[PDB]
């Protein structure tokens, strides 16, 4: 069962929470990771298409679209490439077309574009974004 406001009560329920913030309260990737970890969780990993649908439905209920959210995507070693901060394997992927492109060699964190495509992009880790936690 999920904590109240994070999802449903069944044993198979997965728990996510959107953090949409104004520009003075958006966070870098590391700040967002630390925020979710302080609650006992982490930035959201999206391990399969079922979790993608869960998050998309939360976005539809939010009223807003087109917002950029940090996910738990962070580059590891050159041989690893992208990893999830929660340690789970990056098996499922939904990178946007041409991504990750490491544009200008300075993009080591991953963001979700909260549109129907639900696509991922690598971007500068020091950008201030909204974020999604999991527990
Ligand atoms: O702003 C940086 C951002 O610009 C464009 O959208 C693309 O090149 C992306 O791959 C890149 O991450
Ligand atoms: Ca990119």
51: exposed, middle or buried (C-beta count within 10 Å: 0-12, 13-18, 19+)? Answer: middle
| 129 within ligand 1 shell (Cβ under 6 A) | no
Q: For ligand 1, what atom is nearest to the CA of residue 107?
A: 12
Strands (E), 1-135: 16-19, 42-43, 68-75, 82-84, 109-113, 120-123, 130-134
Experimental determination approach used: X-ray
Q: If we measure between CA atoms, which residue out of 135, 4, 5, 133 comes closest to residue 69?
A: 133
Judge whether 69 and 111 are in contact, CB under 8 Å.
Answer: yes
Give me the helices (H) in 8-134, please: 29-38, 49-62
Residues 24/119, Cβ–Cβ less than 8 Å: no
Residue 67 CA, ligand 1 centroid: distance in Å: 15
In this structure, are residues 122 and 68 in contact, taking their beta carbons and an 8 Å threshold?
Answer: no
Helix-, strand-, coil-residue percentages of the chain, each rounded to 5: 20, 25, 55
Which atom of ligand 1 is least distant from the CA of 122? Answer: 12
Are 88 and 47 within 8 A, CB to CB?
yes
Each domain of the chain, given as residue ranges in start order, spans: 6-135
Tell the residue nearest (CA) to atom 3 of ligand 1: 123
Residue with tokens 């391990």: 47
Residues, beta carbon < 5 Å, ion ligand 2: 101, 103, 107, 121-122
CA distance 44 to 69: 10
Question: Do residues 13 and 2 make contact, with C-beta atoms less than 8 angstroms apart?
Answer: yes
- The candidate with the shortest Cα–Cα distance to 68, out of 107, 122, 5, 15, is 122
Ligand 2 centroid – CA 63 distance (Å)? 26
Of 21, 3, 18, 14, the closest CA to residue 112 belongs to 18
């Amino acid at each position: 069962a999920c904590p109240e406001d994070w999802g449903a009560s069944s044993r198979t329920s997965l728990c996510f929470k959107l953090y949409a913030k104004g520009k003075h309260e958006k966070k870098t990737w590391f700040e967002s990771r630390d925020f979710c970890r302080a609650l006992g969780g982490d930035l959201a990993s999206i391990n399969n298409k079922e979790e993608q649908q869960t998050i998309w439905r939360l976005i539809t209920a939010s009223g807003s679209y087109h917002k950029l959210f940090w996910l738990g995507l962070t580059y590891g070693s050159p041989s690893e490439g992208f990893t999830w901060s929660d340690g789970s394997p990056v098996s499922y992927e939904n990178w946007a077309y041409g991504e990750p492109n490491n544009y200008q060699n300075v993009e080591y964190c991953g963001e979700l574009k909260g549109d129907p495509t639900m696509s991922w992009n690598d971007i500068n880790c020091e950008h201030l974004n909204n974020w999604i936690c999991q527990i």
